Design a protein around this nucleic acid. Structure first.
Lengths: 114, 118, 54
RNA sequence: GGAGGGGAGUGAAAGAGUACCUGAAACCGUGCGCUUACAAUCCGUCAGAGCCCUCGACGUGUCGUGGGGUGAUGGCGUGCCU
RNA sequence: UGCAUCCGGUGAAGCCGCCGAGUGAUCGAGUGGUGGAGGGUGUGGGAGUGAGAAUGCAGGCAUGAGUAGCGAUUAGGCAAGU
RNA sequence: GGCACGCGAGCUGGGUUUAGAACGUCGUGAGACAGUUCGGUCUCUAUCCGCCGCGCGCGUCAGAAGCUUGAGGAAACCUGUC
């Protein structure tokens, strides 16, 4: 098995599916190419995911003392966080429901040989 | 020049004309402006034809320019430096550089500037 | 018109799979010495230093 | 930037972190094994090739009073309640 | 719950599995994980004792769907700064 | 001639077929008349099949590129005077 380190961003105020759309672009890629892809990705959900990946890479480099050049984004996914309920008043007196969803993003980077 | 194939820029023809005039004024006053890519794409022929009018500097051409620019300081600069500067260049007074997209609405931004090589 | 029936998992997932984002293509650039990735659309802008590069 | 997190600690336990005892189901993911793009399927049931896993015996893979997962293919098959 | 016995921080209940068992509702003083304080058996006593549906109630969450819409009839642009 | 005497999630509301009012007739009366006249809200963001167009993926036993044969299918088929 390979050495690894993980980071987690909980209660990120983005919907889970929108975060997954961005996440599906950086599965199995190295940390640097994933960071560039998220930097040039035209989605607002890319900033939190890039922050999580950078935090995981820093955790791997610092606490375990792993070489950042060998880091690879092995496991990454976004779950569902607590959602808050709002009300949008509508025509003819009816009230509809609005869901303000959040998400948790988990990233596991690991050191792989060149 | 060639009219826009599709709907106008600012949402109406008059607003589009005012927008082009203001953009040309800003470009001549500063030397380079940053705006959405279609705006610069439409601004290129307008500014280049104004510069062409300024190149052959006569009272008739001055009136022709002033009927679109409306700003007298910019007109004076256009007919004093910008005009004579491009005296021996035949076309291609401006250039368009594509830059990073806007953050609020992901609009494609571009920078349009006058050439200063020669 | 309103849906007459609840969509099954298979159809929902199959149609949902088409909502995705494409990865932009990146080429290298040399600015201030260090090499970094920039989309080819912004190559000239990066070379003239018009793009903020963190 | 914060939020949040990774080390380090306190704790018997942080699979007790002031979103906190126990933490089910619906619902949403990630990884692995089988299968699926010539096909008319109340979505199961009975036969069933192949692939993967596992329990014994004998050799080097091959059977067995075996067990599992997925199942190409054939037969049958008009949801529940009032 | 009366009575009589047995188990339990050397880990009860609850929950998630494996391997099995009964003619049925079902069972496992058989075990693995989680959990942390009460349970089993025999014989009687009493039930707020068993839900799948009442256009049933409360909470949570799905399909439609990342879809409609983002609320008038004026219009915003450039440079600089934070 | 058939196909909900085709076709209102395609349109119209002239008639019929609510509530106002009048005439003739019937009923003591409230009222009534397959008798007459004026006026009188036609709601919906397309899930599935269906149809018209357009793409993505894979297949056609190496990967490609030009030019094509065509099984099969569709369109068209009117008529006058001098």
């Amino acid at each position: 098995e390979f050495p690894s380190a993980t980071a987690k961003a909980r209660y990120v105020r983005v919907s889970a599916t929108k975060a997954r759309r961005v996440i599906d672009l950086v599965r199995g890629k190295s940390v640097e190419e994933a960071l560039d892809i998220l930097r040039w990705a035209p989605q607002a959900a890319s900033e939190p995911v890039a922050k999580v990946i950078a935090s995981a890479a820093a955790n791997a480099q610092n606490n375990e003392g792993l070489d950042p050049s060998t880091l690879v984004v092995a496991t990454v996914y976004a779950d569902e966080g607590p959602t808050a309920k709002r009300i949008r008043p509508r025509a003819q007196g009816r009230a509809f429901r609005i869901r303000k969803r959040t998400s948790h993003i988990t990233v596991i980077v690991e050191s792989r040989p060149p | 020049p060639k009219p826009t194939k599709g709907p106008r820029l600012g949402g109406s023809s008059s607003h589009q004309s005012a927008l082009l005039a203001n953009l040309a004024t800003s470009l001549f006053e500063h030397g380079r402006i940053k705006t959405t890519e279609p705006k610069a794409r439409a601004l290129r022929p307008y500014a280049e034809k104004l510069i062409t009018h300024a190149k052959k500097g006569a009272l008739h051409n001055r009136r022709e320019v002033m009927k679109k620019i409306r700003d007298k300081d910019v007109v004076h600069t256009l007919f004093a430096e910008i005009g004579p500067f491009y005296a021996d260049r035949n076309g291609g007074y401006t250039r368009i550089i594509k830059v990073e997209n806007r953050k609020g609405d992901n609009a494609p931004m571009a920078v349009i500037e006058l050439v200063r090589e020669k | 018109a309103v849906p007459k029936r609840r969509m099954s998992r298979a159809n929902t997932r199959s149609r949902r799979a088409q909502w995705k984002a494409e990865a932009p293509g990146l080429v290298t650039v040399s600015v201030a010495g260090q090499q970094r990735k920039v989309p080819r659309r912004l190559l000239k802008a990066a070379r003239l230093g018009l793009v903020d590069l963190d």
